[PDB]
Amino acid sequence: NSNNWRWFDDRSGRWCSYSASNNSTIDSAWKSGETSVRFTAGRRRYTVQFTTMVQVNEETGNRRPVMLTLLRVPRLN
Amino acid sequence: NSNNWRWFDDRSGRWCSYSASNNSTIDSAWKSGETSVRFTAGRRRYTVQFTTMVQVNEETGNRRPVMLTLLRVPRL
Amino acid sequence: NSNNWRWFDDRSGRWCSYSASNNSTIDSAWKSGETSVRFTAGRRRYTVQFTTMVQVNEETGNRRPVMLTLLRVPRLN
Amino acid sequence: NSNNWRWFDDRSGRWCSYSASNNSTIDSAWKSGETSVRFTAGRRRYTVQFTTMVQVNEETGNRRPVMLTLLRVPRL
């Protein structure tokens, strides 16, 4: 029970979701008012920066966009 | 932290916050994709229905409106 | 093509929508950064206050709650 | 005013705003419940798909991500 963050994969041309651990790490940081947060995926080190909504590969500087899904209000049946 | 859920008090004409415990129970059900959530306040039994955004007194059927305020949105 | 505002009717226990004119008046005010806006419905004069999200009957002071619907991102098929 | 729509530029690694005209065309289609919207920028033809949140080059099939930033949310 946390928000679903996504990162854009320019290869498949699609928004992909994070692992449940990486999604929880990111969403905890977001909830606490952090401007950035670190995690690893594929044995690669990432910072997500909330101020620019991008994910940075710390080793190469390569920036991929992230998004926060918005759940409908009201909710649908 | 968590999202801020309120119910409207027609007596006082204002939007009131739930108890931190009730808030987290509701927001957890909201995040998990549930269509409703059940809890107790003033030693009374309530269901919040997310598809009508109301709080139901389980004794009376009495319906009070609820709202979601987002703690934080993406900016620039 | 504007946001859908609703007011709560304690009588029917339901969120109701405004007329297209009253919805457009309210949403224009919202979009421009106004804190309040005036309209009439049922030959009765209302102010909506965005700071408290309520609708006030100017003659009686009676307050009913309003809400702004949030459209899902992404949109569903 | 209107909502702020952006597309991601992989060349510069940043989120860019559309032209005010393109923005209003997109946000109007968004408000009306459309599932897509069509326009032109850099004298090129694009469709934005709201169900995948991407901008499609109509010549190439090339997909760029788009985002919605809300100008204003309810608070207290």
Swiss-Prot record, chains A, C:
Known disease link: Intellectual developmental disorder, X-linked, syndromic, Turner type: An X-linked neurodevelopmental disorder with highly variable clinical manifestations. Common features consist of moderate to profound intellectual disability, delayed or absent speech, short stature with small hands and feet, and non-specific but recurrent dysmorphic facial features such as macrocephaly, microcephaly, a broad nasal tip, deep set eyes, epicanthic folds, short palpebral fissures and a short philtrum. Patients may manifest other features, such as hypotonia, seizures and delayed bone age.
Annotated tissue distribution: Weakly expressed in heart, brain and placenta but not in other tissues. Expressed in a number of cell lines, predominantly in those from colorectal carcinomas.
Superkingdom of this protein's organism: Eukaryota
Name of the gene: HUWE1
Cited function: E3 ubiquitin-protein ligase which mediates ubiquitination and subsequent proteasomal degradation of target proteins. Regulates apoptosis by catalyzing the polyubiquitination and degradation of MCL1. Mediates monoubiquitination of DNA polymerase beta (POLB) at 'Lys-41', 'Lys-61' and 'Lys-81', thereby playing a role in base-excision repair. Also ubiquitinates the p53/TP53 tumor suppressor and core histones including H1, H2A, H2B, H3 and H4. Ubiquitinates MFN2 to negatively regulate mitochondrial fusion in response to decreased stearoylation of TFRC.
Compartments it resides in: Cytoplasm; Nucleus; Mitochondrion
Record's comment on post-translational modification: Phosphorylated on tyrosine; phosphorylation is probably required for its ability to inhibit TP53 transactivation.
Name of the protein in its database record: E3 ubiquitin-protein ligase HUWE1
Residues of the whole record sequence present: 1613 to 1689 of 4374
Family, per entry: Belongs to the UPL family. TOM1/PTR1 subfamily.
Known partners and oligomeric status: Interacts with isoform p14ARF of CDKN2A which strongly inhibits HUWE1 ubiquitin ligase activity. Interacts with MYCN, POLB and CDC6. Interacts with isoform 2 of PA2G4. Interacts with NR1D1. Interacts with AMBRA1. Interacts with HAPSTR1. Interacts with HAPSTR2. In hepatocytes, interacts with PAQR3; the interaction promotes PPARA poylubiquitination and STUB1-mediated degradation.
Domain comment as written in the entry: The HECT domain mediates inhibition of the transcriptional activity of p53.
Annotated ranges, domain WWE: 1-68
Curated annotation (Swiss-Prot), chains B, D:
Ranges for domain WWE: 1-68
Tissue: Weakly expressed in heart, brain and placenta but not in other tissues. Expressed in a number of cell lines, predominantly in those from colorectal carcinomas.
Post-translational modifications: Phosphorylated on tyrosine; phosphorylation is probably required for its ability to inhibit TP53 transactivation.
Parts forming coiled coils: none
Top-rank taxon: Eukaryota
Protein localization: Cytoplasm; Nucleus; Mitochondrion
Domain comment, as recorded: The HECT domain mediates inhibition of the transcriptional activity of p53.
Assembly and interaction partners: Interacts with isoform p14ARF of CDKN2A which strongly inhibits HUWE1 ubiquitin ligase activity. Interacts with MYCN, POLB and CDC6. Interacts with isoform 2 of PA2G4. Interacts with NR1D1. Interacts with AMBRA1. Interacts with HAPSTR1. Interacts with HAPSTR2. In hepatocytes, interacts with PAQR3; the interaction promotes PPARA poylubiquitination and STUB1-mediated degradation.
Function of the protein: E3 ubiquitin-protein ligase which mediates ubiquitination and subsequent proteasomal degradation of target proteins. Regulates apoptosis by catalyzing the polyubiquitination and degradation of MCL1. Mediates monoubiquitination of DNA polymerase beta (POLB) at 'Lys-41', 'Lys-61' and 'Lys-81', thereby playing a role in base-excision repair. Also ubiquitinates the p53/TP53 tumor suppressor and core histones including H1, H2A, H2B, H3 and H4. Ubiquitinates MFN2 to negatively regulate mitochondrial fusion in response to decreased stearoylation of TFRC.
Family: Belongs to the UPL family. TOM1/PTR1 subfamily.
Disease as annotated in the protein's UniProt record: Intellectual developmental disorder, X-linked, syndromic, Turner type: An X-linked neurodevelopmental disorder with highly variable clinical manifestations. Common features consist of moderate to profound intellectual disability, delayed or absent speech, short stature with small hands and feet, and non-specific but recurrent dysmorphic facial features such as macrocephaly, microcephaly, a broad nasal tip, deep set eyes, epicanthic folds, short palpebral fissures and a short philtrum. Patients may manifest other features, such as hypotonia, seizures and delayed bone age.
Protein's recorded name: E3 ubiquitin-protein ligase HUWE1
Source organism: Homo sapiens
Gene that encodes it: HUWE1
